[PDB]
Protein: Nitric oxide synthase, brain
Amino acid sequence: RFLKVKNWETDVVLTDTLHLKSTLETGCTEHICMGSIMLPTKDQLFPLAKEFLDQYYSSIKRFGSKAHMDRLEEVNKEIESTSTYQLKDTELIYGAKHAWRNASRCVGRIQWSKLQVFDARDCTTAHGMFNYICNHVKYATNKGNLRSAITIFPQRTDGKHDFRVWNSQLIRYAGYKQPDGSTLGDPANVQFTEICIQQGWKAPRGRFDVLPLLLQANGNDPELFQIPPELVLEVPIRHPKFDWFKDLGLKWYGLPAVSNMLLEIGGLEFSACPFSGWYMGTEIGVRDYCDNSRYNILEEVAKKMDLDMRKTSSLWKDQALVEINIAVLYSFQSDKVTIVDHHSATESFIKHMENEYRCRGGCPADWVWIVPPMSGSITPVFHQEMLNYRLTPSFEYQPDPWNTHVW
Amino acid sequence: RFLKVKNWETDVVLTDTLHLKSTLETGCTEHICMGSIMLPVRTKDQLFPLAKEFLDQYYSSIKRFGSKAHMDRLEEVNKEIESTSTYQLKDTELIYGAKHAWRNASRCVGRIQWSKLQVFDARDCTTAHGMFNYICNHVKYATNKGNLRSAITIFPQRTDGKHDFRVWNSQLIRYAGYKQPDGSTLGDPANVQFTEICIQQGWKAPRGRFDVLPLLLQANGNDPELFQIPPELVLEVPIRHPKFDWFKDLGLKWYGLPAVSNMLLEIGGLEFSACPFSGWYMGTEIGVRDYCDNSRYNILEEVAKKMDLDMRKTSSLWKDQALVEINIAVLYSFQSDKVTIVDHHSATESFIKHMENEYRCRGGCPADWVWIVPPMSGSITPVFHQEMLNYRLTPSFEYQPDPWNTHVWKG
Ligand code: HEM
Ligand code: HEM
Ligand SMILES: CCCOc1ccc(-c2ccc3c(C)cc(N)nc3c2)cc1CN
Ligand SMILES: CCCOc1ccc(-c2ccc3c(C)cc(N)nc3c2)cc1CN
Ligand SMILES: C[C@H](O)[C@H](O)[C@H]1CNc2nc(N)[nH]c(=O)c2N1
Ligand SMILES: C[C@H](O)[C@H](O)[C@H]1CNc2nc(N)[nH]c(=O)c2N1
Ligand SMILES: [Zn+2]
Structure:
């Protein structure tokens, strides 16, 4: 019950005791593993607060101290009357950093304690939200020297006043159904690009059209906002060997800033909390160019490489995928925009695992998601046994707003 | 209660009722997933339930559930247990069991072939020499001059755990691993331990880089014995590259027949501790793991040098780039010699078809995503985007401890 995990490349063994703090469920049972499934009141709220506040005050080495019990009774009394409660700034920051720290699917968590937290809990309007997001974006980009950030809009109250950023990421390209069959722009975002038009967006109908922001504050009909272009840093994609690679007319944006998840701290629910860091190369090149429901430039790259595309066993897809990913990293590094290759970041994660087992007794991890989408076996996380379990504070999934909004 | 999985690349959903037949425990709990853990003498007290269950399955498969042939067989196995404390499978039952063991192998991507398994009943074997002759015929039959045919050879079942039959090799054909004084390894680093046991048991090692290891065979719980597979029975393929003519000069070769020998076949409560089984290679098993894993032959950096790659920063992706070429050369060498091999794209596509077919005509197909996804180019194969349900069905192939850890040495 004090589980162990083994790295089979190095024989390192770590003993996991952190998992016995786990609260939520995984979806798995004694009889069935779901490790690869994508998505599984006043009386409930107070224990959730006690638990969070207990771990908060131990983290600062004041468990059982005067300040601890007073803060507990303070929160205790506010739940009684107000039915909820508000986090002190210090807890807000702790909670945001530990939701990233507990993000069992995130490979970049070695940076978790350097997060920049922007308290936007005083926001009241979509224009307000837009101001906060533009500030987040500018701070995060930092002229290419990217910095981790999260901006936290007001907590849920009764589900009727939800703050929601309707974009899945703050910065994403547009996707348009072409009359003939295929897709122009980016096929992931075709339905959202519809909604923006459905809401009043003048789509330029190019390939790399930065989508507008669709901001929803206090539960009202959301509003369209154009991010100032000078805040959207983009990297034109070129290959350090193949001159013809520029001709494909490819670029990506520098700032990955995920905006559709829900942040849960001490039982409180922050449905608007866009957070950002920086890209691993494969997130753009393997996934955001080469997945069959994405750009499928794989064929053109290999065509332009005059590779034998007549049978899968020439591995021409793999060979193109490598080149594309070499190009994505070359371009970002050439323009001094932060990016991490998948060898770099998996080795960091292993180091971070080491540190978590050493000074925390464990580290929840979702092997299925930590292993990069190419070259998995030659990265050091492949041979790393991991234990997956759900800790609080956390980032959670939430329904898309456009299935729920009382319009 | 029914369960659903979604393929996110195609939006195809499938409903699994077959997990309800699951009994063995996965290692996971409601609060902890052990989905990435490598590894998460039986009395008649609990053997007839296991027998009845298997026999219920078998007679369902032949649509004779509840027939007099079915009830009589139950009654026959019944008396044989209380009287002998074990029981014997009919040939039919043994063949069903071995096929369904493979069909239930949730980590195996090659299961589209599962019904075509050639089952060799070696349950009359009694000695190590007897085993050597059974294995030699397996190898010849399965190889078939490069037109590989999957087979399994099933040796006698465990009785009291003190008379086990064991193949001590992890595979029938593997290359020797030699640890040098200077700390380097000659041959296959994966086999250094087994090689030393062989040498200690009296094997005269050629001490080369691709020495086929001797068979180490154990019958009836006796001390294991060494035998050299005849070299004309070991089909090998020298590794060359279709564009690089310096690749042949790395002097690499690999053998054609993957044949796993260290696992335990469980059928209806009986344990078959020695049951080597073979099929044919997916290319990445040689190209990605057998050559490029940091703890294996690790010709990665030598291939990168001959390719004159930027080996300074990892972000030149030289490792990925050399990996692709090495897998290109493995597929090319095998196809050039008409030795059966499958690339990882072809095989993941087949498994998806297989998996979909299994959901429709069986109500489920247990599958270990961690293992099914290929160890390179994972996301550009259709299993990466495929949700999977993992559960243990019997008959099954199980792991078992290395015999040299548990053996009682006669002397
Ligand atoms: C700083 C560099 C970072 C890198 C390289 C990184 C990398 C990744 C990767 C590769 C994934 C896997 C999903 C996929 O590949 O499609 C992921 C998931 C995730 N990231 Fe990180 N990340 C970073 C920063 C952050 C930050 C700052 C946060 C929040 C404060 C965060 C929160 C998450 C969460 C919650 C998930 C999992 C979401 C889910 O369960 O669906 N990440 N990340
Ligand atoms: C004929 C073509 C076959 C192919 C291409 C194939 C491929 C694979 C691969 C790639 C793995 C992953 C293991 C690794 O990569 O380290 C695997 C696992 C496995 N294979 Fe298959 N296989 C084939 C036939 C068979 C046959 C005939 C059997 C037995 C009758 C079998 C039994 C298994 C089992 C039991 C596992 C799971 C290993 C475990 O649980 O540790 N396979 N297979
Ligand atoms: C629904 C299937 C996709 O799931 C995913 C997949 C990935 C991420 C994710 C989240 C944050 C990231 C940050 C901060 C930096 C970075 N470099 N990468 C990230 C990737 C979120 C989700 C949830 N939408
Ligand atoms: C705990 C270590 C897991 O390792 C492994 C790794 C691989 C296989 C395996 C087994 C059979 C195969 C056949 C018939 C064909 C083929 N092409 N590949 C196979 C690969 C088994 C095990 C379990 N002994
Ligand atoms: C079906 C499968 O579980 C799903 O596609 C997951 C698998 N692992 C992943 N891993 C990462 N890093 N990112 C992903 O989007 C996914 N997708
Ligand atoms: C830690 C991890 O579970 C382990 O290294 C597994 C992962 N998946 C694998 N998948 C395959 N096909 N072969 C393997 O050897 C492994 N190793
Ligand atoms: Zn699980």
Q: What stands out?
A: The longest strand of chain A covers residues 116-119. Chain A has three domains: 16-121+148-158+262-276+346-370, 122-147+162-233+397-401, 234-256+279-344. Chain A has ten helices and 16 strands.
